[PDB]
Amino acid sequence: CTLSAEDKAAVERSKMIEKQLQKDKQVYRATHRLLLLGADNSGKSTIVKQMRIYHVNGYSEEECKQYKAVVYSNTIQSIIAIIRAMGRLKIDFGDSARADDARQLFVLAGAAEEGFMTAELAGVIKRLWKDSGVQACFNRSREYQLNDSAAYYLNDLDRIAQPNYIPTQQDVLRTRVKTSGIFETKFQVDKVNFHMFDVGAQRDERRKWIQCFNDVTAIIFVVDSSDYNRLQEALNDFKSIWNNRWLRTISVILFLNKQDLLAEKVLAGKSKIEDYFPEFARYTTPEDATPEPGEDPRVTRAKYFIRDEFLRISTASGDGRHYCYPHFTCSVDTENARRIFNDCRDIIQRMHLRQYELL
Amino acid sequence: KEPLRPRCRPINATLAVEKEGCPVCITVNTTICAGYCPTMTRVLQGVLPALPQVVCNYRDVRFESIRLPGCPRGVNPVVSYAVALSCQCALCRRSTTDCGGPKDHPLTCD
């Protein structure tokens, strides 16, 4: 076609952007989005910890670049905050030498970089941190807006200044550990990209943010079976999410964590579930139950009663559109990955069959 | 067969072979289908179709060629003759030959 030089350059840029976004989409479609819900005492932290040992290759090229950029930005912000605290303190504690002050000023001016921190800035920051006055000012201004990891960044600034730095996963989490509300994590099962969204540390108003999560493939719900009293709140939350208009089309997976704790608690013979749930006395063990050898009958009966109640509340409406996949949860085994992969495969197959007129 | 009223069988007759472009006439031995076959005429007319009469003729023939001695130039000096090993009496096709009234023409070169 015929176009102007500026028009040709714009078309070339648009084509490059289109190619880049197509490449990003190629990977995006292969990733399955999953959302995790659980109470503070539900043990979700333990659940995520178990899968944390099997992260997705530890790190990725794009992930590594993003982590390096975040670390550089955090270091620059910490240096700027330290300089501001030193300059605004009661005593104008300056650098030991005018060269250090000039280097700090240049770094502050150079903080406008696009994510890459020059080695000179890192060296200047490290030299400034070695000064006794700078350390004293930082200690006296620990209550300022300086990042909590400022000391760690200063101590590790020597390694950060080296090219091709590879920060540890714990270090990256600490750098990104804040009041974000999202705890992203990556893990691979059967060479399949799996995402998990830990949501919390925010207002308990599910009517405001669950709306956008209608595209999630499945929602994981985790509740601690040990706490008999917490069941009522858990039951109410499950009922509310199940009846949610936006989420009334996505299946859920239930994990009954703290199985060992529940077994230990019921071993005392207190039987506090009866008071909370009077129907437990009239409940009976299902004929399809397959308890493991050596398990106390009371614990298995209670677990199966809880599972039956969860199924009954879920089957109130919209059973065909979306199902429920409860599983006994114990943070002592790695079989959870296989169970969740099987559940995802089953729900994907059911969804595919729904549109093929086979169900 | 019997010496009298022989059937339609080949005989060692002599036939003259010549071409328009070759004035030389050459006579060689050839098999000629001659004899007698049963024939009859319908006893009624105007009711049933006339019954065809079988005439002795040759059923299978073989092509034989002989050298042409000094035939005139401008034409192919090839002479073809038909030799029949078996003979039978049957109707003669219109395009097969010119079967008709007897002629008793000589079989030699005039």
């Binding site: - | 328009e20 008709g100 002629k103």
Partner: protein, 88 residues
Amino acid sequence: QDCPECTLQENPFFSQPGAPILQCMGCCFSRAYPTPLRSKKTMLVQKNVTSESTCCVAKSYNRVTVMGGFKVENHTACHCSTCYYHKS
């Protein structure tokens, strides 16, 4: 052979009692030979065989009456001169 010669014979099925029907038939011989150069040039169409056909036919016939009212002719003489229905 034993084929009868060219002479009148009784009708196999048209010979009413008291008046046999005469039919003409025979075993007249025929001769044929390959067409010579003169014969070939005497035919407008291409012919590679020449045959002479002689058949026994009734010289004359009379008027006779057959059973059922059918009109038939009774032969009075037989001779081998030519053929009429030989061509097909």
